[PDB]
Amino acid sequence: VLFGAIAGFIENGWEGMIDG
């Protein structure tokens, strides 16, 4: 739609579980 979250959800995805 906008694209911001089409990266933001991936980043909050990755940096949702670096540790563990």
Side-chain angles (χ1 to χ4, degrees):
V1 188
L2 286 301
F3 199 85
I6 315 300
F9 184 72
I10 323 304
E11 289 295 87
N12 288 266
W14 165 42
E15 278 279 46
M17 52 179 176
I18 292 189
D19 184 28

PDB file of all heavy atoms in Angstrom:
ATOM      1  N   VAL A   1       0.897  -1.172   0.000  1.00  0.00           N
ATOM      2  CA  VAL A   1       0.000   0.000   0.000  1.00  0.00           C
ATOM      3  C   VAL A   1       0.923   1.206   0.000  1.00  0.00           C
ATOM      4  O   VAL A   1       1.508   1.484  -1.042  1.00  0.00           O
ATOM      5  CB  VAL A   1      -1.020  -0.031   1.159  1.00  0.00           C
ATOM      6  CG1 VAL A   1      -2.057   1.096   1.017  1.00  0.00           C
ATOM      7  CG2 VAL A   1      -1.749  -1.373   1.190  1.00  0.00           C
ATOM      8  N   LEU A   2       1.214   1.778   1.174  1.00  0.00           N
ATOM      9  CA  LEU A   2       2.573   2.212   1.440  1.00  0.00           C
ATOM     10  C   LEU A   2       3.460   0.959   1.536  1.00  0.00           C
ATOM     11  O   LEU A   2       2.943  -0.159   1.668  1.00  0.00           O
ATOM     12  CB  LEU A   2       2.646   3.048   2.737  1.00  0.00           C
ATOM     13  CG  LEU A   2       2.093   4.489   2.688  1.00  0.00           C
ATOM     14  CD1 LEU A   2       2.818   5.349   1.645  1.00  0.00           C
ATOM     15  CD2 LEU A   2       0.576   4.563   2.468  1.00  0.00           C
ATOM     16  N   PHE A   3       4.785   1.142   1.486  1.00  0.00           N
ATOM     17  CA  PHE A   3       5.749   0.042   1.559  1.00  0.00           C
ATOM     18  C   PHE A   3       6.471  -0.027   2.910  1.00  0.00           C
ATOM     19  O   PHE A   3       7.116  -1.028   3.205  1.00  0.00           O
ATOM     20  CB  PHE A   3       6.737   0.137   0.386  1.00  0.00           C
ATOM     21  CG  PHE A   3       7.467  -1.165   0.095  1.00  0.00           C
ATOM     22  CD1 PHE A   3       6.867  -2.134  -0.732  1.00  0.00           C
ATOM     23  CD2 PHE A   3       8.728  -1.424   0.666  1.00  0.00           C
ATOM     24  CE1 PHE A   3       7.521  -3.354  -0.982  1.00  0.00           C
ATOM     25  CE2 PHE A   3       9.377  -2.648   0.424  1.00  0.00           C
ATOM     26  CZ  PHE A   3       8.774  -3.614  -0.400  1.00  0.00           C
ATOM     27  N   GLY A   4       6.334   0.996   3.762  1.00  0.00           N
ATOM     28  CA  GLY A   4       7.112   1.142   4.992  1.00  0.00           C
ATOM     29  C   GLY A   4       7.049  -0.102   5.881  1.00  0.00           C
ATOM     30  O   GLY A   4       8.078  -0.609   6.312  1.00  0.00           O
ATOM     31  N   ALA A   5       5.844  -0.625   6.113  1.00  0.00           N
ATOM     32  CA  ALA A   5       5.581  -1.818   6.908  1.00  0.00           C
ATOM     33  C   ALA A   5       5.934  -3.114   6.167  1.00  0.00           C
ATOM     34  O   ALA A   5       6.163  -4.128   6.820  1.00  0.00           O
ATOM     35  CB  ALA A   5       4.102  -1.836   7.311  1.00  0.00           C
ATOM     36  N   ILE A   6       6.036  -3.090   4.832  1.00  0.00           N
ATOM     37  CA  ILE A   6       6.426  -4.240   4.009  1.00  0.00           C
ATOM     38  C   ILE A   6       7.937  -4.510   4.123  1.00  0.00           C
ATOM     39  O   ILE A   6       8.429  -5.556   3.710  1.00  0.00           O
ATOM     40  CB  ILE A   6       5.946  -4.021   2.549  1.00  0.00           C
ATOM     41  CG1 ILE A   6       4.492  -3.489   2.442  1.00  0.00           C
ATOM     42  CG2 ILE A   6       6.086  -5.285   1.682  1.00  0.00           C
ATOM     43  CD1 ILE A   6       3.412  -4.397   3.048  1.00  0.00           C
ATOM     44  N   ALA A   7       8.642  -3.587   4.772  1.00  0.00           N
ATOM     45  CA  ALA A   7       9.963  -3.742   5.356  1.00  0.00           C
ATOM     46  C   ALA A   7       9.852  -3.768   6.886  1.00  0.00           C
ATOM     47  O   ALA A   7      10.448  -4.632   7.520  1.00  0.00           O
ATOM     48  CB  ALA A   7      10.872  -2.605   4.878  1.00  0.00           C
ATOM     49  N   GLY A   8       9.059  -2.874   7.497  1.00  0.00           N
ATOM     50  CA  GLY A   8       8.992  -2.733   8.947  1.00  0.00           C
ATOM     51  C   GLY A   8       8.612  -4.030   9.664  1.00  0.00           C
ATOM     52  O   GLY A   8       9.186  -4.333  10.710  1.00  0.00           O
ATOM     53  N   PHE A   9       7.682  -4.811   9.104  1.00  0.00           N
ATOM     54  CA  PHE A   9       7.278  -6.102   9.652  1.00  0.00           C
ATOM     55  C   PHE A   9       8.384  -7.156   9.515  1.00  0.00           C
ATOM     56  O   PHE A   9       8.446  -8.074  10.325  1.00  0.00           O
ATOM     57  CB  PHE A   9       5.997  -6.568   8.944  1.00  0.00           C
ATOM     58  CG  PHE A   9       5.411  -7.853   9.499  1.00  0.00           C
ATOM     59  CD1 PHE A   9       4.779  -7.853  10.757  1.00  0.00           C
ATOM     60  CD2 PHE A   9       5.511  -9.055   8.770  1.00  0.00           C
ATOM     61  CE1 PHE A   9       4.251  -9.045  11.284  1.00  0.00           C
ATOM     62  CE2 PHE A   9       4.983 -10.246   9.296  1.00  0.00           C
ATOM     63  CZ  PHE A   9       4.353 -10.243  10.553  1.00  0.00           C
ATOM     64  N   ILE A  10       9.272  -7.024   8.524  1.00  0.00           N
ATOM     65  CA  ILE A  10      10.390  -7.942   8.310  1.00  0.00           C
ATOM     66  C   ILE A  10      11.478  -7.651   9.352  1.00  0.00           C
ATOM     67  O   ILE A  10      12.121  -8.564   9.862  1.00  0.00           O
ATOM     68  CB  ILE A  10      10.963  -7.778   6.879  1.00  0.00           C
ATOM     69  CG1 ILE A  10       9.920  -7.502   5.769  1.00  0.00           C
ATOM     70  CG2 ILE A  10      11.833  -8.990   6.503  1.00  0.00           C
ATOM     71  CD1 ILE A  10       8.791  -8.522   5.614  1.00  0.00           C
ATOM     72  N   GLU A  11      11.642  -6.374   9.700  1.00  0.00           N
ATOM     73  CA  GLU A  11      12.680  -5.858  10.580  1.00  0.00           C
ATOM     74  C   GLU A  11      12.270  -6.144  12.014  1.00  0.00           C
ATOM     75  O   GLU A  11      13.034  -6.759  12.750  1.00  0.00           O
ATOM     76  CB  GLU A  11      12.884  -4.351  10.349  1.00  0.00           C
ATOM     77  CG  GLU A  11      13.562  -4.025   9.010  1.00  0.00           C
ATOM     78  CD  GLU A  11      14.998  -4.555   8.946  1.00  0.00           C
ATOM     79  OE1 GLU A  11      15.155  -5.731   8.549  1.00  0.00           O
ATOM     80  OE2 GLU A  11      15.914  -3.787   9.311  1.00  0.00           O
ATOM     81  N   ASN A  12      11.026  -5.806  12.381  1.00  0.00           N
ATOM     82  CA  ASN A  12      10.415  -6.266  13.628  1.00  0.00           C
ATOM     83  C   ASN A  12      10.254  -7.792  13.639  1.00  0.00           C
ATOM     84  O   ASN A  12      10.026  -8.364  14.703  1.00  0.00           O
ATOM     85  CB  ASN A  12       9.048  -5.596  13.853  1.00  0.00           C
ATOM     86  CG  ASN A  12       9.171  -4.123  14.227  1.00  0.00           C
ATOM     87  OD1 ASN A  12       9.195  -3.769  15.398  1.00  0.00           O
ATOM     88  ND2 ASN A  12       9.242  -3.235  13.247  1.00  0.00           N
ATOM     89  N   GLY A  13      10.380  -8.454  12.482  1.00  0.00           N
ATOM     90  CA  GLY A  13      10.412  -9.909  12.407  1.00  0.00           C
ATOM     91  C   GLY A  13      11.778 -10.436  12.846  1.00  0.00           C
ATOM     92  O   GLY A  13      11.875 -11.252  13.761  1.00  0.00           O
ATOM     93  N   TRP A  14      12.836  -9.948  12.193  1.00  0.00           N
ATOM     94  CA  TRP A  14      14.226 -10.303  12.432  1.00  0.00           C
ATOM     95  C   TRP A  14      14.623  -9.903  13.849  1.00  0.00           C
ATOM     96  O   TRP A  14      14.948 -10.765  14.667  1.00  0.00           O
ATOM     97  CB  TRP A  14      15.084  -9.603  11.368  1.00  0.00           C
ATOM     98  CG  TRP A  14      16.560  -9.548  11.609  1.00  0.00           C
ATOM     99  CD1 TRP A  14      17.335 -10.547  12.086  1.00  0.00           C
ATOM    100  CD2 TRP A  14      17.452  -8.408  11.416  1.00  0.00           C
ATOM    101  NE1 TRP A  14      18.646 -10.119  12.162  1.00  0.00           N
ATOM    102  CE2 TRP A  14      18.776  -8.802  11.766  1.00  0.00           C
ATOM    103  CE3 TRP A  14      17.269  -7.075  10.994  1.00  0.00           C
ATOM    104  CZ2 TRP A  14      19.866  -7.921  11.685  1.00  0.00           C
ATOM    105  CZ3 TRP A  14      18.352  -6.183  10.902  1.00  0.00           C
ATOM    106  CH2 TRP A  14      19.649  -6.603  11.247  1.00  0.00           C
ATOM    107  N   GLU A  15      14.504  -8.613  14.172  1.00  0.00           N
ATOM    108  CA  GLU A  15      14.777  -8.075  15.505  1.00  0.00           C
ATOM    109  C   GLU A  15      13.594  -8.298  16.462  1.00  0.00           C
ATOM    110  O   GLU A  15      13.462  -7.642  17.495  1.00  0.00           O
ATOM    111  CB  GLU A  15      15.213  -6.598  15.406  1.00  0.00           C
ATOM    112  CG  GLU A  15      16.707  -6.450  15.072  1.00  0.00           C
ATOM    113  CD  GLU A  15      17.607  -6.615  16.308  1.00  0.00           C
ATOM    114  OE1 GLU A  15      17.376  -7.572  17.084  1.00  0.00           O
ATOM    115  OE2 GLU A  15      18.530  -5.783  16.460  1.00  0.00           O
ATOM    116  N   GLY A  16      12.776  -9.302  16.152  1.00  0.00           N
ATOM    117  CA  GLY A  16      11.873  -9.952  17.081  1.00  0.00           C
ATOM    118  C   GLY A  16      12.514 -11.200  17.689  1.00  0.00           C
ATOM    119  O   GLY A  16      12.055 -11.650  18.737  1.00  0.00           O
ATOM    120  N   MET A  17      13.559 -11.769  17.059  1.00  0.00           N
ATOM    121  CA  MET A  17      14.200 -13.003  17.504  1.00  0.00           C
ATOM    122  C   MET A  17      15.587 -13.189  16.875  1.00  0.00           C
ATOM    123  O   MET A  17      15.857 -14.179  16.193  1.00  0.00           O
ATOM    124  CB  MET A  17      13.285 -14.212  17.263  1.00  0.00           C
ATOM    125  CG  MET A  17      12.732 -14.328  15.835  1.00  0.00           C
ATOM    126  SD  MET A  17      11.667 -15.772  15.578  1.00  0.00           S
ATOM    127  CE  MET A  17      11.149 -15.444  13.874  1.00  0.00           C
ATOM    128  N   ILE A  18      16.487 -12.241  17.143  1.00  0.00           N
ATOM    129  CA  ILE A  18      17.919 -12.511  17.007  1.00  0.00           C
ATOM    130  C   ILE A  18      18.270 -13.457  18.153  1.00  0.00           C
ATOM    131  O   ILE A  18      18.560 -14.628  17.910  1.00  0.00           O
ATOM    132  CB  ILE A  18      18.797 -11.236  16.971  1.00  0.00           C
ATOM    133  CG1 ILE A  18      18.515 -10.465  15.661  1.00  0.00           C
ATOM    134  CG2 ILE A  18      20.289 -11.632  17.084  1.00  0.00           C
ATOM    135  CD1 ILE A  18      19.472  -9.296  15.389  1.00  0.00           C
ATOM    136  N   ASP A  19      18.210 -12.972  19.399  1.00  0.00           N
ATOM    137  CA  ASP A  19      18.339 -13.852  20.551  1.00  0.00           C
ATOM    138  C   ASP A  19      17.197 -14.871  20.528  1.00  0.00           C
ATOM    139  O   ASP A  19      16.085 -14.579  20.080  1.00  0.00           O
ATOM    140  CB  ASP A  19      18.367 -13.062  21.865  1.00  0.00           C
ATOM    141  CG  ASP A  19      18.610 -13.980  23.071  1.00  0.00           C
ATOM    142  OD1 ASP A  19      19.265 -15.032  22.878  1.00  0.00           O
ATOM    143  OD2 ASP A  19      18.134 -13.618  24.168  1.00  0.00           O
ATOM    144  N   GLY A  20      17.505 -16.095  20.948  1.00  0.00           N
ATOM    145  CA  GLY A  20      16.612 -17.245  20.928  1.00  0.00           C
ATOM    146  C   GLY A  20      16.350 -17.809  19.525  1.00  0.00           C
ATOM    147  O   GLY A  20      15.885 -18.942  19.423  1.00  0.00           O
TER     148      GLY A  20
END
